[PDB]
Each structure stands twice: as C-alpha cells, then as structure tokens.
Design an enzyme around this catalytic site. Structure first.
Site, short mmCIF file in Angstrom:
data_model
loop_
_atom_site.label_atom_id
_atom_site.label_comp_id
_atom_site.label_asym_id
_atom_site.label_seq_id
_atom_site.Cartn_x
_atom_site.Cartn_y
_atom_site.Cartn_z
N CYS B 42 0.80 -1.22 0.00
CA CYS B 42 0.00 0.00 0.00
C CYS B 42 0.83 1.27 0.00
O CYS B 42 0.33 2.34 -0.33
CB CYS B 42 -1.00 -0.01 1.16
N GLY B 275 -6.57 -13.90 1.68
CA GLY B 275 -6.16 -12.76 0.89
C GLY B 275 -6.93 -12.60 -0.41
O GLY B 275 -8.06 -13.10 -0.54
C1 LIG Z 1 0.06 -0.41 -5.49
C2 LIG Z 1 -0.99 -1.04 -4.54
C3 LIG Z 1 -1.67 -0.21 -3.63
C4 LIG Z 1 -2.67 -0.83 -2.71
N1 LIG Z 1 -3.38 0.02 -1.78
C5 LIG Z 1 -4.31 -0.59 -0.90
C6 LIG Z 1 -5.01 0.22 0.04
O1 LIG Z 1 -4.75 1.57 0.10
N2 LIG Z 1 -5.92 -0.38 0.88
C7 LIG Z 1 -6.15 -1.75 0.82
O2 LIG Z 1 -6.96 -2.37 1.75
N3 LIG Z 1 -5.48 -2.56 -0.10
C8 LIG Z 1 -4.55 -1.92 -0.96
N4 LIG Z 1 -3.85 -2.77 -1.90
C9 LIG Z 1 -4.28 -4.16 -1.92
C10 LIG Z 1 -3.38 -5.11 -1.10
O3 LIG Z 1 -2.20 -4.91 -1.07
C11 LIG Z 1 -3.96 -6.55 -1.12
O4 LIG Z 1 -5.33 -6.65 -0.82
C12 LIG Z 1 -3.09 -7.49 -0.25
O5 LIG Z 1 -1.69 -7.35 -0.51
C13 LIG Z 1 -3.61 -8.95 -0.32
O6 LIG Z 1 -2.76 -9.83 0.36
P1 LIG Z 1 -2.29 -11.19 -0.47
O7 LIG Z 1 -1.41 -12.07 0.60
O8 LIG Z 1 -3.49 -11.89 -0.92
O9 LIG Z 1 -1.47 -10.71 -1.82
P2 LIG Z 1 0.03 -9.99 -1.80
O10 LIG Z 1 0.24 -9.12 -0.63
O11 LIG Z 1 0.14 -9.22 -3.22
O12 LIG Z 1 1.13 -11.20 -1.65
C14 LIG Z 1 0.99 -12.35 -2.44
C15 LIG Z 1 2.38 -12.90 -2.74
O13 LIG Z 1 2.40 -14.30 -3.15
C16 LIG Z 1 3.44 -14.40 -4.12
N5 LIG Z 1 3.10 -15.53 -4.98
C17 LIG Z 1 2.08 -15.63 -5.87
N6 LIG Z 1 2.16 -16.92 -6.45
C18 LIG Z 1 3.23 -17.59 -5.85
C19 LIG Z 1 3.74 -18.86 -6.03
N7 LIG Z 1 3.12 -19.73 -7.01
N8 LIG Z 1 4.83 -19.26 -5.31
C20 LIG Z 1 5.43 -18.40 -4.41
N9 LIG Z 1 4.92 -17.13 -4.22
C21 LIG Z 1 3.83 -16.75 -4.96
C22 LIG Z 1 3.47 -13.10 -4.88
O14 LIG Z 1 4.64 -12.92 -5.65
C23 LIG Z 1 3.28 -12.11 -3.76
O15 LIG Z 1 4.45 -11.58 -3.21
C24 LIG Z 1 -2.92 -2.20 -2.75
C25 LIG Z 1 -2.20 -3.08 -3.71
C26 LIG Z 1 -1.25 -2.48 -4.57
C27 LIG Z 1 -0.48 -3.40 -5.54
S1 LIG Z 2 -1.17 -3.24 1.68
C1 LIG Z 2 -1.49 -2.96 3.45
C2 LIG Z 2 -1.11 -4.24 4.19
N1 LIG Z 2 0.07 -4.84 3.57
C3 LIG Z 2 1.01 -5.57 4.40
O1 LIG Z 2 0.61 -6.08 5.40
C4 LIG Z 2 2.42 -5.81 3.85
C5 LIG Z 2 3.14 -7.03 4.45
N2 LIG Z 2 2.76 -7.37 5.83
C6 LIG Z 2 3.52 -8.36 6.58
O2 LIG Z 2 4.47 -8.89 6.10
C7 LIG Z 2 3.11 -8.63 8.04
O3 LIG Z 2 1.88 -8.02 8.35
C8 LIG Z 2 4.26 -8.22 9.01
C9 LIG Z 2 4.78 -6.84 8.61
C10 LIG Z 2 5.40 -9.26 8.94
C11 LIG Z 2 3.70 -8.16 10.46
O4 LIG Z 2 2.79 -9.19 10.78
P1 LIG Z 2 1.83 -9.05 12.13
O5 LIG Z 2 0.38 -8.43 11.71
O6 LIG Z 2 1.69 -10.36 12.78
O7 LIG Z 2 2.49 -7.88 13.12
P2 LIG Z 2 3.85 -8.11 14.02
O8 LIG Z 2 4.07 -9.52 14.34
O9 LIG Z 2 5.11 -7.45 13.19
O10 LIG Z 2 3.61 -7.27 15.44
C12 LIG Z 2 3.31 -5.89 15.33
C13 LIG Z 2 2.60 -5.29 16.55
O11 LIG Z 2 1.16 -5.68 16.70
C14 LIG Z 2 1.07 -6.60 17.83
N3 LIG Z 2 0.23 -7.75 17.44
C15 LIG Z 2 0.16 -8.34 16.10
N4 LIG Z 2 -0.76 -9.37 16.15
C16 LIG Z 2 -1.28 -9.45 17.49
C17 LIG Z 2 -2.22 -10.29 18.09
N5 LIG Z 2 -2.89 -11.32 17.31
N6 LIG Z 2 -2.55 -10.11 19.48
C18 LIG Z 2 -1.94 -9.13 20.23
N7 LIG Z 2 -0.98 -8.26 19.62
C19 LIG Z 2 -0.65 -8.43 18.27
C20 LIG Z 2 2.48 -7.02 18.14
O12 LIG Z 2 2.70 -7.63 19.38
C21 LIG Z 2 3.20 -5.74 17.91
O13 LIG Z 2 3.11 -4.79 18.96
P3 LIG Z 2 4.48 -3.98 19.41
O14 LIG Z 2 4.26 -3.37 20.93
O15 LIG Z 2 4.74 -2.76 18.32
O16 LIG Z 2 5.60 -4.91 19.40
CL LIG Z 3 1.66 -1.38 3.28
#
Ligand SMILES: Cc1cc2nc3c(=O)[nH]c(=O)nc-3n(C[C@H](O)[C@H](O)[C@H](O)COP(=O)(O)OP(=O)(O)OC[C@H]3O[C@@H](n4cnc5c(N)ncnc54)[C@H](O)[C@@H]3O)c2cc1C
Ligand SMILES: *SCCNC(=O)CCNC(=O)[C@H](O)C(C)(C)COP(=O)(O)OP(=O)(O)OC[C@H]1O[C@@H](n2cnc3c(N)ncnc32)[C@H](O)[C@@H]1OP(=O)(O)O
Ligand SMILES: [Cl-]
Ligand SMILES: Cc1cc2nc3c(=O)[nH]c(=O)nc-3n(C[C@H](O)[C@H](O)[C@H](O)COP(=O)(O)OP(=O)(O)OC[C@H]3O[C@@H](n4cnc5c(N)ncnc54)[C@H](O)[C@@H]3O)c2cc1C
Ligand SMILES: *SCCNC(=O)CCNC(=O)[C@H](O)C(C)(C)COP(=O)(O)OP(=O)(O)OC[C@H]1O[C@@H](n2cnc3c(N)ncnc32)[C@H](O)[C@@H]1OP(=O)(O)O
Ligand SMILES: [Cl-]
Ligand SMILES: [Cl-]
Ligand SMILES: [Cl-]
Ligand SMILES: [Cl-]
Ligand SMILES: [Cl-]
Ligand SMILES: [Mg+2]
Ligand SMILES: [Mg+2]
EC number: 1.8.1.14
Lengths: 437, 437
Positions: B42, B275
C-alpha cells in the site's frame, strides 16, 4: 396544546422548533431570563478568541425573527420564578418592568440548563463564561482595558478552550487549577499532552493552586505567590438552574437535578425536562447518568417533540456519555462510564498506542486508545483516546459499538476503512480486540 | 504441525507470524517467488511519489530478520509450481538454480494474491505496479530517462494514487480509462471531485479512451489522437495467481479464485486460502463477496492462525466491503454492497450534505453522506461519503453499525462526540436517521 418552554437555547429553542415541525397549530411560548435566545454556546470560546467574528455565528435568531419564521413566541428578559403545577401555570417575572404574571400551559418543557459557579470575590476584573452577554462583556473588557495578562481558573474543557482562544487572540494567559485533576472526563494519566502543549508554548500553569486574595489587579495565591493580572476568567464548575423549581411538586435529586423517564417526563403529568438539568441512565449499563452536553439536549428535544406532537412510541434508550475536546494540536475523547464509575464493575483494561495512520505514511502521530470491559460478560464499559489525529474517529466507532452491545472480543471483527492516510489493516480498534483476553 | 505458506506478504507473512504467536514448536516455511517478503504494497504509490523516501518504510522484513525474530523460514525467489494435495507436498521451483523439489506439509496456507494485468503491448516504456521490484524499476526508469510526460492507464483507486504521486513528484501525468466508471467502488455521481481535482491542477484526462498502438514514444489512441509519452503506467486490473493450482483437487471458480468457508478452508482438507485469492460472502446480506483489500488479508490471517494453533471456534462472519481512497484534497469512502449489487434488493436512498464540523468553526467543508437501506427490513445495505474532511469517520461508524445489521432509523440514536472542530450536535449520521421517515 398550549406549550410553554423555559430556556430558549440548546434544549429549549431546539425543542420548540422541533414541535413546530410536527404541529403548526399549537401556541408555543418560550421564556428566557437573559437577553439572547439561540446563542451558540459552543462557539463562545472561539468568539472570545476572535476565531469566530461574524455575529451571525454567535446567535441564530432574535425573538422577532424566530416568531416571523416559526410563529413561536419568545420572551427574553423574562424569568420563570415559580412553577404552579397544580394550577398548570408558571409565574414569570418580566425583568424590564419588574412585574410578574401567570402563564398557563397544557404542556411545560423545562430546559433551564446550568449557571457558571463563581469564586465569590468582589472583583471588577473577574468573569465567568456561560452566554453571549458574558461573551460580549469579556470582549469589551479586553478592549477597554488593553488586557494583556489573563488568569484562567479551572481546567475543564471550557477553561481549556478559553485559554487556547485567549492565546490565539494574542493575549498571555496563565492557567491555575485547585488540584492536578485536569480535564476530568478523560483518564487522569492520559491528560499529559495538555501540560505538554502549555510548556511547548511557554504558557505558565500552576496546579494545586487557588486565588487567595484580590486587590485590584494584584492577585495573591494559595501558594503564596503574588502576581498582577489584567483579567480573570473563572471556570470553576456549574450548578443546575433549579431553585425556581423547588417549591413545586417536581421531584429533584439532592444535587438539584431533575430525574426523568425515557420520554423525558418528570414525575408531574404534562411537565418534561431536558438538557443539562435532566438526569437519566446509561444505555449500556444499569446506572444513573447525567451528561450535560449538546448531543443530549438536542436528542431529548427531538424525543419530547415526538412525545407531544409526533410518534409517542419513540423513547430515549439512555446515555453513553460520548464527549470530546480539542486543545491546541491534541484531541481528547472518551465514551462510556466515567473514571469514577468503573469501580462498580469487575473490569479489565486493554490499550494500544499506534500511529493514527500508516507508519510509513508522513504526518503521522501516535494515537493512544484505551478500552475498559466488564469481565463478567466482556461488554465494553468505557473507551478513551488521545492524540493529534484520529481520536474522534476511534471514539465514535466505539460509541456505535457500545450502542450495539458489542463485546471487546468482537472488536477484531470491525472492518475498518483502510488506505495509508487513514488507518492500518489491523486498526487500533482491531488491536484492542486482539490484545484483550 | 508442519506449515507451508505460499506468498510472503499481506496474507502470508502475516498468517505465519500469527501462527507463531500461538505456537512456538511448529515448523513454518514460506515460499515467495519474487525478491522481497513483507513489502508494503500500500506504500508503493507513495514511494513512487517520493512521499516515502526511506525505503526501509517499504520493506518490513528480510528472510534473515524473520528467522531471527520469529524462527520462521522464508525462501525468496522460490515459486510454488504445483500442489500435490493427495501426497501433501508442494512442488517448488528454485528460480535461481532452476531446480525444483517437493516440500511436505501438514497444513498448507495459500496467499498468492493477484498479479497486474497488462495490455500486452511490445513496449519498453510501459510498467505495471504490484511489488517493490516494480517500484524500483519504475523509479529507476524515471531517473534514467528523465521522464516528464507519463500516461496513466486506468482509473481505479491505485492508479489514481499513482497519478497523484507522479504529479507531486513533479511529472506531468495524463489519465485515460476505457470507460467512464472511474474509482468504481464509489457511487458514480459522487466521483466528480476526482475530475474536479484533475481540472484544478490542469492534469489532462480522457474517459472512454484506450491505447490503439504503441510506436516507441508515439502513442496512438482509440479517439484518433496521437501523443508522445516518456512512460506509461498500466493499471488495467489484476488476475488471481492460481495457475499453479489448476492441476490440484482445489475447487476454483470460473474466474480462477478460490471459494472458501468461514474457516478459510478450501474444499481440500488441510489446505486454507486467504487474501486476494479467496472468495467469501457478505456479512449483512446473503450474497457472495470478493474484497481484495488489506483488512481482509490480515483478518483471514488471524482466523487461520486460530484455526490451526488457537481457538478453532473463531470463524469469519463475512465481508462488509469497507474501502477508501485519498485523491488530492478529497476522501472517497464506501461500505456495503457494490453499486451494481443494489438491484438485488428493494431499496431507498437517503443523503445529507452538511459541514464536516460546526459551521462557525474555520476550515469547514461540505461532506456528502449517502445511505441505502432495504425497504423490507430497514437494514442498511450500503453507505458512501465524499468530502475533504470527515468521510472516513462517518463510513467507519456506519461499518460498525452494519456489522450489527443496524437499521437506518436507529441512526438517530447514534451518540456522536461533539465539539465544534469535529461534528454537529445532530451529526450527519443522525440526520440520515431523521431524514429516513
Ligand atoms: C500499489 C498497490 C496499492 C494498494 N493500496 C491498498 C489500500 O490503500 N488499501 C487496501 O486495503 N489494499 C490496498 N492494496 C491491496 C493489497 O495490497 C492486497 O489486498 C493485499 O496485498 C492482499 O494480500 P495477499 O497475501 O493476498 O497478496 P500480496 O500481498 O500481493 O502477496 C501475495 C504474494 O504471493 C506471491 N506468490 C504468488 N504466487 C506464488 C507462487 N506460485 N509461489 C510463491 N509465491 C507466490 C506473490 O509474488 C506475492 O508476493 C494495494 C495493492 C497495490 C499493488
Ligand atoms: S497493503 C497494506 C497491508 N500490507 C502488508 O501487510 C504488507 C506485508 N505485511 C507483513 O508482512 C506482516 O503483516 C508483518 C509486517 C510481517 C507483520 O505481521 P503481524 O500483523 O503479525 O504484526 P507483528 O508480528 O510485526 O507485530 C506488530 C505489533 O502488533 C502486535 N500484534 C500483532 N498481532 C497481534 C495479536 N494477534 N494479538 C496481540 N498483539 C498483536 C504485536 O505484538 C506488535 O506490537 P508492538 O508493541 O509494536 O511490538
Ligand atoms: Cl503497506
Ligand atoms: C463556553 C461553553 C462551551 C461549550 N462547549 C460544548 C462542546 O464543545 N460540546 C458539547 O456537547 N457541549 C458544550 N457546552 C455545553 C452545552 O452548551 C450544553 O450542554 C447545552 O447548552 C445544554 O442545553 P440547555 O437547554 O440545557 O442549557 P442552555 O443552552 O445553557 O440554555 C438554558 C437557558 O435557560 C435559561 N434559564 C435558566 N433558568 C430560567 C428561568 N428560571 N426562566 C427563564 N429562563 C431560564 C438560561 O438563561 C439559558 O439561556 C458548552 C457550554 C459552554 C457555556
Ligand atoms: S453547544 C452546541 C449546540 N448549540 C445550540 O444548540 C445553540 C442553540 N440552538 C438553538 O437555539 C436551536 O437549535 C435553533 C438554532 C434555534 C434551531 O433552529 P433552526 O431553525 O436553525 O434549525 P432547525 O432545527 O429549525 O432546522 C434546521 C434544518 O435542519 C434540518 N432538520 C432539523 N430537524 C430535522 C428533522 N427532525 N428531520 C429532518 N430534518 C431536520 C432541516 O434542514 C432544517 O431545515 P429544513 O428547512 O427543514 O431543511
Ligand atoms: Cl453552538
Ligand atoms: Cl400550584
Ligand atoms: Cl501498544
Ligand atoms: Cl498428489
Ligand atoms: Cl467452499
Ligand atoms: Mg403554590
Ligand atoms: Mg508500538
């Protein structure tokens, strides 16, 4: 029916207007003891701050305009001095002529509100803030005396708003409060940013401090300190305007408020009470509640209008006590039972501090959200949020949750609107639910 | 149990992390076909806009850090190419060596998400945006070619964010979209401020427009126009990453998504899907739902963790589809059924346009709030808000109301947090309720 209203502002004028919406025939008369009807109570500090400078924002109507528009008679400078409930009249003192008369009613609606407390000093430089008369007098005193240094007494939301506005106007306020219990609707340990904002702007404050003596502009304090001030604004609480009610058959509590049922009826047939004067109960717990704020005055005004001229099945469901104040860059909001009322429950507290929006996203500020829940049923009892951003959003969401009897655990299920400027994929609200247990 | 996760981002890395919170003994391995795990999907548009400078903000973890902190093994540049579900292994291609191997599992969690669609042109100046590799490539290309004029294809919310960011970076974008349905999760009439903001900044746009041919930097359009562009970002939809799943026993819908139950289980024992790849149903109505957003990825991640290693009575209750986007000065948020889904109900619409906060308080702006309700039961089906201020707050409150199948009429009872900077004594939300009769 012939309708008489006492008080022509947040509860009273609103209620009268709502009745007229439903009923175009009934005679409606409002008595207001002071000069103005429909003044904007909540705007007053901002008028003083010169943030709000158009008079049209300071009051909505004059009696002449209100009559022209709505055919509602409003008599200003008319003070109700007794309620003769057995004969269904009120006794009214025309303050211009100093003559009193009886006014009969079929329905009587009491919205007299509260008055500001005074410290009682014999001081020409001391003012309270409750209405537009007060506001005009403060503005005029500042100008006539080239006021620079202002002492602000008390640390409730009114005083705090007044302090901020005096500062923005270019004056130099100092804040004192008799104890360290500032902004009492908020958790005590969550009010620090008030003091931080004062310090940041080098605005002096002293807690556990009181006025001891006043000699012209020379103020002697309890701490023993001696200072000179041009003006003093006392925000030292309010009291209910009910003394005029005491001789009637209307039941008052020992603090002078009027308990009402869910139709905002008093114990006396055909007499309603609404606004700050009225007490009710919480919606989410079986406890009494008094919430002297605008939402309640307006909601009750609507309910009473339905009771008298509309759908009389519409009844109040109780208060949640949602409340909020801005102080410089910060927002302080809370909802549910007051800190002092938590002790009546077996409860636990959960909290999270997190950016209001995406961590990677700029302009971020830490938002502290705290939720108290009942251990016996997991129901949410109270929530509080303080931060530069997003506190109002989280507290309104939690208000809606409490309206719907949500458990703390169910907060994990809240589907937030997420994009980086707004929140997180697991919002602070979700995190409370995850962190509960 | 031995856990294999496919995809190391919003759903996958999150789920693996949530399992580890509950279970410190199980072996967890994640396969990720591309370079980076846990990139901030995001944040990507804002990285392009140089609003997010610190690339550290764009990547939460490396596999080494993930193992050190969570004892979870993540293999990047490892693509799962088949699911051998009967033997409970997956076939994994090591993209660095081009050698494949099988990994056994007791539980398999699929979070492969979606890939960007392409128009398919033979062009070295066209890019799509889905991950950090893409963002790096775009940033690099802009610098290497001193890109100024950029064609942004597609008017979905992500493309809009990309456009704003290119503009704020100093480039000169033009927006085109093959239809007039821009920002399609919002009511079409309420999307006008998008076009207004474009107009205000003299950013050209053309709707019902498409690329016909690409000849170097010479782009020929459906309209017959010919323009030179330095770069093209195509945001023309996504497709599910499910090709590697087709040979398995997992049931896919006709679009290649995976229908799951409320435990996020596929039709195949021991295999979950979460997802963007997974389809479910709405919480408040009996219709299918697909909501490819971050909240849903994170929520499903926690539910699967509870299923596998925690409290297995915790189940999904369905989507509401809460969504939001910022575009320049304006916020666009909606929740509930999509516009095209309204026709499956007998419904009415209520709307108000009022100041976001007290009219007398400075910096006010008109907030348009719209609510659709089901005439058979008064339940709220959908809500949408657009304004410079306060739209996120109103839509989150309505999400919480809908979560409880609250009725439109009950909105009169919502107890808002009122002070002048925040709302009104009768908030927009209350007014919807009052206006619904
Ligand atoms: C530019 C952008 C802006 C966004 N902004 C928002 C927002 O403002 N608000 C919002 O709620 N959502 C937003 N989204 C949507 C959001 O990021 C998704 O809803 C979210 O990432 C879904 O999680 P996911 O695990 O399903 O997919 P992803 O986070 O995209 O991760 C899936 C992963 O699996 C991997 N993968 C796929 N196939 C295989 C395979 N066969 N083997 C190994 N790995 C594989 C991919 O390479 C990828 O890294 C945005 C997305 C994009 C691209
Ligand atoms: S596109 C918008 C969303 N996209 C993404 O999420 C991108 C990739 N995200 C990820 O890879 C994961 O979400 C990562 C960044 C690895 C983090 O996963 P978690 O959601 O599990 O968060 P953390 O383990 O890093 O912990 C962060 C803080 O939140 C508290 N916390 C998480 N989950 C719980 C639960 N189930 N119950 C109580 N607390 C929880 C953590 O303890 C932590 O708090 P701190 O005091 O900051 O340590
Ligand atoms: Cl993000
Ligand atoms: C400076 C200030 C700032 C505030 N800010 C906020 C805020 O940000 N948010 C919020 O929710 N609330 C705020 N409030 C609280 C709010 O205004 C009250 O809750 C609301 O005005 C209550 O309505 P009411 O009709 O009960 O009392 P009022 O609106 O005060 O009206 C009562 C009227 O009755 C008249 N009256 C009393 N006795 C008689 C009598 N015997 N005969 C004839 N007339 C009589 C009075 O003169 C008065 O005008 C603020 C109040 C003040 C003073
Ligand atoms: S401290 C914060 C609160 N401060 C105060 O309340 C200050 C004191 N207030 C008052 O004196 C009254 O509230 C006044 C200002 C006298 C009420 O008079 P108004 O005439 O301004 O406002 P109305 O309440 O009469 O109507 C304004 C518009 O709001 C809509 N509307 C109100 N009530 C309803 C209901 N029940 N249902 C639907 N719509 C409603 C309407 O727009 C109304 O004007 P219309 O012409 O009906 O559209
Ligand atoms: Cl007001
Ligand atoms: Cl009597
Ligand atoms: Cl925390
Ligand atoms: Cl097999
Ligand atoms: Cl299924
Ligand atoms: Mg008598
Ligand atoms: Mg922290």
């Amino acid at each position: 029916p012939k309708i008489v209203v006492v008080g022509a502002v947040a509860g009273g004028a609103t209620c009268a207007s709502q009745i007229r919406r439903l009923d175009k025939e009934s005679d409606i008369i409002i008595f207001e003891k002071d000069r103005d009807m429909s003044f904007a109570n909540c705007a007053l500090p901002y008028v003083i701050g010169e943030v709000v400078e158009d008079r049209r924002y300071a009051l909505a109507y004059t009696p002449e305009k209100f009559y022209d528009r709505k055919q509602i008679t409003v008599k200003t400078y008319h003070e109700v001095i007794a309620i003769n409930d057995e004969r269904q009249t009120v006794s009214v003192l025309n303050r211009k002529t100093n003559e009193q008369f009886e006014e009969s009613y079929d329905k009587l609606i009491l919205s007299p509100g509260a008055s500001a407390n005074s410290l009682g000093f014999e001081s020409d430089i001391t003012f309270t803030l409750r209405n537009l008369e007060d506001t005009d007098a403060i503005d005029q005193f500042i100008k006539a005396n080239q006021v620079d240094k202002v002492l602000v007494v008390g640390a409730g939301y009114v005083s705090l708003e007044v302090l901020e506005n005096l500062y923005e106007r270019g004056l130099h306020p100092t804040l004192i409060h008799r104890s360290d219990k500032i902004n009492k609707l908020m958790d005590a340990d969550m009010n620090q940013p008030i003091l931080d904002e004062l310090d940041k702007r080098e605005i002096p404050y002293r807690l556990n401090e009181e006025i001891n003596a006043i000699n012209g502009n020379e103020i002697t304090f309890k701490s023993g300190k001696v200072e000179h001030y041009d003006m003093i604004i006392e925000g030292v609480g309010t009291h209910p305007n009910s003394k005029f009610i005491e001789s009637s058959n209307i039941k008052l509590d020992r603090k002078g408020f009027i308990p009402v049922n869910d139709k905002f009826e008093t114990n006396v047939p055909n007499i309603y009470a609404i606004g700050d004067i009225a007490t009710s109960h919480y919606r989410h717990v079986d406890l009494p509640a008094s919430v002297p704020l605008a939402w309640g005055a307006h909601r009750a005004a609507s309910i009473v209008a339905e009771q008298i001229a509309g759908n009389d099945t519409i009844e109040f469901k109780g208060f949640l006590g949602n409340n909020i104040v801005k102080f410089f860059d910060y927002t302080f909001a809370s909802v549910g039972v007051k800190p002092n009322e938590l002790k009546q429950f077996d409860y636990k507290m959960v909290e999270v501090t997190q950016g209001a929006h995406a961590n990677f996203y700029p302009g971020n500020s830490p938002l502290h959200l705290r939720v108290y829940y009942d251990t016996s049923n997991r129901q949410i009892l109270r929530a509080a949020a303080v931060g530069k951003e997003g506190a109002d959003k989280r507290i309104d969401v939690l208000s809606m949750a409490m309206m719907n009897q949500l458990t703390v655990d169910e907060l994990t299920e809240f589907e937030v609107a997420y994009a980086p400027p707004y929140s997180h994929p697991k919002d602070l609200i979700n995190m409370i639910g995850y962190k509960a247990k």
